[PDB]
Structure formats: C-alpha cells, structure tokens
C-alpha cells in the first residue's frame, strides 16, 4: 500500500512584485519516501534548490520542504514538479500568490 504526495506551492511571505521572497514547494502525506521535486521558472528547472531534512507525520507519511530565493514579478511563472512511485507522470502545480 502506497500513498501519493500532497503538493502546495507558495511563498514564505505575501508576494509583492519586485521584493525578494522565498518560493516553497511542500510535499507531504506520501509513502514510500523516495520522491523527486523540481522548482520551475518559466518551465525551466531552478538550480541549487535546497530542502529540509526528511521527516514524517503521526500517520507515518513523509514530508519535505523544497525552497529557493526568488523575486516575484507580474509575468514570470513559477511551479513545482513532483514525481513519486504512485504517479504515472510528474505532476506540475503552478504558483498562485493567492493560495
């Protein structure tokens, strides 16, 4: 029995165009622990993204935070791309500053 990841993409602080911030991709609720996570800027992989140490919740499912510095603008598009044994293809979730 395996558990597919939940995915939220969001900023550390409320987004203001032109002001430096942090872009977060939080993957959680998944089992087993192997997981592949990319942060994207206009469709391209952002290099040197860092991530928290693997840990797990009371229901034994794993979670990770992937994050990188970014400066939001009106037009640049950001997303997180996730792959896991439970997913046929990588799942891409777009960043929306209102969520």
């Amino acid at each position: 029995i395996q558990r597919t990841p939940k995915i939220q993409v969001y900023s550390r602080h409320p987004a203001e165009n032109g002001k430096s911030n942090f872009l977060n991709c939080y993957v959680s609720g998944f089992h087993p622990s192997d997981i592949e996570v990319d942060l994207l800027k206009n469709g391209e992989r952002i290099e040197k993204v860092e991530h928290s140490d693997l840990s797990f919740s009371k229901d034994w499912s794993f979670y990770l935070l992937y994050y990188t510095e970014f400066t939001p603008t009106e037009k640049d598009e950001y997303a997180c791309r996730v792959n896991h044994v439970t997913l046929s293809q990588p799942k891409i979730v777009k960043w929306d500053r209102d969520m």
Binding site: I1, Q2, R3, K6, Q8, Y10, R12, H13, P14, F22, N24, Y26, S28, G29, H31, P32, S33, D34, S52, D53, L54, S55, F56, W60, S61, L65, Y67, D98, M99
Partner: protein, 276 residues
C-alpha cells in the same frame, strides 16, 4: 505551555543500491534540533538548532555512537521483517520508529510514547501504561513476545519518566527564547470573485508557532465544515507555519460569514470577517 520531545528513526532498504539508509531526527515541539544520516559523508549526530550547540563533545560522541549502533540494529531489523512477512530480498522496505515524552504546563510528565511501523503500517506500540504492548498483526506478536521476555517496556518506562523529561526540561531552558515562545497567527480575510454570482472568502493564518491551530468558517453562526476548503498546515521556512480556510459565498452575502481562529499564542479565540 505544554511541550514534547520526540525522536524519529527511519530505515529504508534499497537492494542493488547499497545498505539501507538510516536517519534519526530529534524534535522539541515543531523545532528540529539534531539529525543523524548514514548517507552523510562522515555520519555524526549533528546540531540543527542553535541552543543545542553548547552541548559538549561527550554529548555528541554518545549520540553518534548510539546512532551508529542503531544503523546496524535497524538493518538487521529490516532483514527480520522480510522473514516475518515472507518477502524477498528484491524489494525496498521501510521501518519507522517514534518515541518521546509529553509535558504539561507545570513541566510534569503527561505521557510517554514508543511506536513502530513497517512499510507505513502500524506494527507495535507501547501502551500508555508504559508497561504493556499492542501488536498490530501476527508478526508484531512475535516481537511482542521477545520484548516481554527482555523487559523492554521497563527500560522504556524508566527512560520516558526520567532521562526524557530531564533532557527536555534542559533543552527548554537553553532554548527558552524560542522553544518557550508561541507566535500568534497574523490573520486576514481575502476576497476572490469566481463569477458574477459567487466569490471565495479565504481566511489566512500566517507566521504562527507552534503548528497546532484551529481555523473554521461559520455562516450565520453555524459551522461550515463540510463546505470549507481547509489546506494542510504548512511550513514557511522561517520556523513558522501557514494555513488557510476558504468558503464559496454568494455575492453580497459576505457579512454573514465569520472566520474563527484558536492558537496558543492568542489570549482568546479570534473572530474576523471580510473587511472591504
């Protein structure tokens, strides 16, 4: 407030890709403070919070030596689990363990914990009496017999009532500026038109610590649980957490809705609404 310490162990096999990876992480409440990883270049128990850095080299040597022993123990346990479930050596499997203690507001022990899972399913747990076990299946019954014979529960009881509480109180004092500080949520309601007919009201809680929070919507004073979209509490990356709750409301009916917030950083529960 109340406080807890937890240690989390994970052992993950990976046949064809070396020996199983073993990790240990220690937490006080929602603050990670130590980590061990067998895949690190030089595996050590290492500090992850500033207030643990003052422990001396004997502290780090002991935590490291135990974690290296545990790496081997849990690799053996993964081999045992294959035998217990009639599984082959080709697949990847995971053992997880949590243990630790919960303190009340007065610093006295509320309860202790020691539980294990195999492949994400509960395997065995120490009961709240810290004296007896609950096994999830016939495999865990075999372990239960071994642990009854070896008086494992008695050892865990002595740790959980003694050393666990004593070290947690020490950490709480050394980290009293942060571990013993609750940050209340910063709250606000945003409004997002969907159509001419409806809009989303989203109630935000930002910047709070610890993670435990309650966030709900009412319409005319009636809970809207089944009609509320409630995301999982999520880390901001600065130690704090975020959450939001959203309802879809008919245009012009926004003042019938109230958002309700409870957090231990708040003196009293908060009520807020959309403020145009």
């Amino acid at each position: 407030g109340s406080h807890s310490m937890r240690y989390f162990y994970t052992a993950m096999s990976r046949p064809g890709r070396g020996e199983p990876r073993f990790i240990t992480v220690g937490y006080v409440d929602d603050t990670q403070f130590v980590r061990f990883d067998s895949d690190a270049t030089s595996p050590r128990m290492a500090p992850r919070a500033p207030w643990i850095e003052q422990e001396g080299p004997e502290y780090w040597d002991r935590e490291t030596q135990i974690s290296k022993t545990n790496t081997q123990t849990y690799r053996e346990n993964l081999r045992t689990a294959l035998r217990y479930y009639n599984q082959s050596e080709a697949g990847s499997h995971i053992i997880q363990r949590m243990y630790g203690c919960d303190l009340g507001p007065d610093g006295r022990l509320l309860r202790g914990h020691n539980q294990l899972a195999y492949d994400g399913k509960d395997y065995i747990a120490l009961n709240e009496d810290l004296s007896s076990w609950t096994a999830a299946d016939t495999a865990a019954q075999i372990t239960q017999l071994k642990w009854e014979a070896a008086r494992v529960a008695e050892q865990l009881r002595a740790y959980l009532e003694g050393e666990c509480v004593e070290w947690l109180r020490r950490y709480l004092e050394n980290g009293k500026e942060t571990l013993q500080r609750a940050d209340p949520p910063k709250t606000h309601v945003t409004h997002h038109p969907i159509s001419d007919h409806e809009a989303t009201l989203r109630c935000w809680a930002l910047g709070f610590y610890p993670a435990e929070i309650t966030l709900t919507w009412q319409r005319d004073g009636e809970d809207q649980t089944q009609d509320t979209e409630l995301v999982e509490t999520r880390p901001a990356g600065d130690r704090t957490f975020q959450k939001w709750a959203a309802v879809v409301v008919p245009s012009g009916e926004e003042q019938r809705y109230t958002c309700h917030v409870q957090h231990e950083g708040l003196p009293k529960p908060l009520t807020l609404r959309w403020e145009p």
